Symmetry: D2
Subunit: 115 residues, 4 copies
């Protein structure tokens, strides 16, 4: 599991469940190409997006579909989604967790990179 996503809801104080997440990788023509996707579980986590073999160095975008999450709860949202864009760099063994904390008009994201 070299790439995991964890999402929390700051309004309800809970994991953000059933949040769609789309991962893209920047192609040679400078466009974003679909790479992996899924929905967060009951724990707010999304595991199994990719494998060590497929997840090569490159520029990636992890897009968290925050607007659809808030709409499913009936809460007015501001953002369309929360894109998290970064370079994956092989610097010894690494696992990347993209964590996000969501509110209707605000969010935070952190990368947790461990060996």
């Amino acid at each position: 599991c070299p790439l995991m996503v964890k999402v929390l809801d700051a309004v309800r104080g809970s994991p953000a469940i059933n949040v769609a997440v789309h991962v893209f990788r920047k192609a040679a023509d400078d466009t974003w190409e679909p790479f992996a996707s899924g929905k967060t579980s009951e724990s707010g986590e999304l595991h199994g997006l990719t494998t060590e073999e497929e997840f090569v160095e490159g520029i990636y975008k992890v897009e968290i579909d925050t607007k659809s999450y808030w709409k499913a709860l009936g809460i007015p949202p501001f953002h369309e989604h929360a894109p998290v864009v970064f370079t994956a760099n092989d610097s010894g063994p690494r696992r990347y967790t993209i964590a996000a904390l969501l509110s209707p008009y605000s969010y935070s994201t952190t990368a947790v990179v461990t060996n």
Copy 2:
């Protein structure tokens, strides 16, 4: 104005208006002594808490009364208040802005310190 407080609401995307703020300073007997207090304005800001003369070196606690704010909006919040504790003026006077962003089950705070 050596100490300012600014509060935003992450649910409504607005300044957090009429938020009570109590400032304490740690006394020689290690207890918290009342220092200054006030309420945020229509802009979510609280100016004029203290003066350069009164704001001496010390350990301060800026307590943002988040529970009363959320209850006045009819939303039950998780926290009792948001205390922000720091040492001030240790290397001479500085201007401190304590900013906070609120949600019912979460908050963030940052300090902007200028010379």
Copy 3:
């Protein structure tokens, strides 16, 4: 001034000065079209991006160039930039402040929308 951007630095406790910001608007062909850009001032603020006349309804992306900011401080950051994507002026004109707080491996963003 219907669109303002404010950026703070969470490591130094200061405004994030000279941060490049690029604003795009989604065109009819679903591509991102350049709309406005600028750099934050000594206060960490970017004013005068657009006018009430030019800032029509649409989907906008406010891309904060966090990587160049951290690299100019000699700190390698995790993200390429911090894109903030939202629909604007859907229920008539509003004043939007996009605020962001930066750390090398994390950032937070909030929107303050006023009428």
Copy 4:
């Protein structure tokens, strides 16, 4: 495990390891009484603070010793610590996670309350 604490470091992009955490419970005389304490593990988590039997309804303060954490890394910090104050309410089965994300001049905290 009815009360857990999880702490992340936004500068290094890692779990915040070996962070001291002190939990207090408000006594009848309105003072804070020590209740439980520990240090976050290699995963940034602190498990086993209390038991279902001891963790009754009441007002609690979870104080994260952020200044000692940053000092151990040699990074200049602003806050003395990050106190998180809340009422524990029995409203069916509940587990409380106090999560925090730390930067030298800023932090965020969220409560994740699950059944």
